[PDB]
Amino acid sequence: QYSIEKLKKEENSLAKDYYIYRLLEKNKISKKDAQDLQSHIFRYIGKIKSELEKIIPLNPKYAKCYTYTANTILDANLTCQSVRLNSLVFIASLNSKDRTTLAQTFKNQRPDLTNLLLAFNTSDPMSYIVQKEDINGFFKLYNYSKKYDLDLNTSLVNKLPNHIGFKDFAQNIIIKKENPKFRHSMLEINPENVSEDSAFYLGVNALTYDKTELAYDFFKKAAQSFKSQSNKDNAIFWMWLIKNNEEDLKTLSQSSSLNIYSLYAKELTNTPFPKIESLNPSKKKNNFNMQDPFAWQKINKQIRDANASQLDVLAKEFDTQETLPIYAYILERKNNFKKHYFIMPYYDNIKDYNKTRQALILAIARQESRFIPTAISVSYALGMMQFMPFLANHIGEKELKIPNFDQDFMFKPEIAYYFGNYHLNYLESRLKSPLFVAYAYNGGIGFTNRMLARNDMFKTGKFEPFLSMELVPYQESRIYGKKVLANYIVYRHLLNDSIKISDIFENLIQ
């Protein structure tokens, strides 16, 4: 470990945060050591904040305004009332006499506040706001209570997409399968009124009610408006699944984006496999330390700051086997993510696993870390396979009994791949398909089991398994699974062990 004073020398980074956090969680930082530690934390969110505030606890314009309570709010001036009435919890806490008075007071200057004040006099504030078609109020109330749910007319639902909250509202209720009356109402949104992710989710919604022509119209709108080729491909795939137009399949097979949809279309049209870059430096190693987390943070900052000529210079400093992940990382930026980099670094460590397992390990590592051995996430997951300290210590200390085990052993590629394999043996025994294994690797076996036990997920159906892949209940896991699955297909191909993509999808249907 590093002493608190040595850490304070280091530049501020997620690595420095992580080591500060290691000392805090062991109670190794004294009260004076802890004093200026606020300024030595790169990202002062989550576990590290909570832990520092056990030692060091934390706008004068409005200090006066928080002296007032529900009982004294009418004594406050207009500015203080305004500030306090930003909270719906606070509005709900008032009595109806005072809400009625405040409603009259704010009628001209804050009419949206008036609507909410009056809404909270009724037993269903959402019904009141819906009657008004007060869109700002609608989203405030949804954020206040996710339980409100009622039928919304065509006029109202077609106004909802003109609010920045709509996208995540729509996504959340669709993938969580909540607010049935809201979901059903959104069938009357005109595709003309939505674009990108909103249009896409409304497509998925329409598919869950078996409105296939409506779904096509939403997916087509998404395909025309998405800015990223990867999302375009996902929308075009749905246009093809619904109407079977050959030109959509062909456009999809010709995509510059390497993803499961474009790969699947290439298979279906006998289009060749995409070109994968082949990187194999002659030099085995240099003086750069790939196990030093601070050195990576420093060189990452320099790479992220660099122009074309500077990236070319940096590439030549890292053209070695041992530094291949940094080299590939530099080159991925130098070609603006246009070429396809699927490296297989520290391969001697996995060569004795069978090729299917190698492909899965590589697929997960590429997604988790791009193979950077000292990768540290915002939750302090570590190394190429991004093990959380809890799991790393459980495997290293309890189950495997490794002498002198520290969780920083995760920065060693030999350990990362070994623990990766170990954890994959456990997941794959229960879950079978590499897609389901990916979901559990990212989101835990618990949520993955609860999901697969549902009678509406990954069962036989017209648009399965593709519909279920859009309804994974966590946005992060949905995306993760698709990316890892694409990576898995590519690594199977690179290992002269190609898999038929159609086979993979057929196996998802339980």
Numbering used by the authors: 19 to 76, 81 to 532
What does the paper say about this structure?
We report here structure-function studies of soluble periplasmic LT of Campylobacter jejuni. The LT Cj0843 was identified from a virulent strain of C. jejuni and localized in the periplasm. The LT enzymes cleave the PG MurNAc-GlcNAc glycosidic bond similar to lysozyme with the noted difference that LTs have an additional (2nd) cyclization step; this step requires a boat conformation of MurNAc leading to a 1,6-anhydromuramyl product as the predominant terminal saccharide moiety. The crystal structure of the soluble LT Cj0843 from C. jejuni revealed an unusual doughnut-shaped structure containing four domains: NU-, U-, L-, and C-domains.
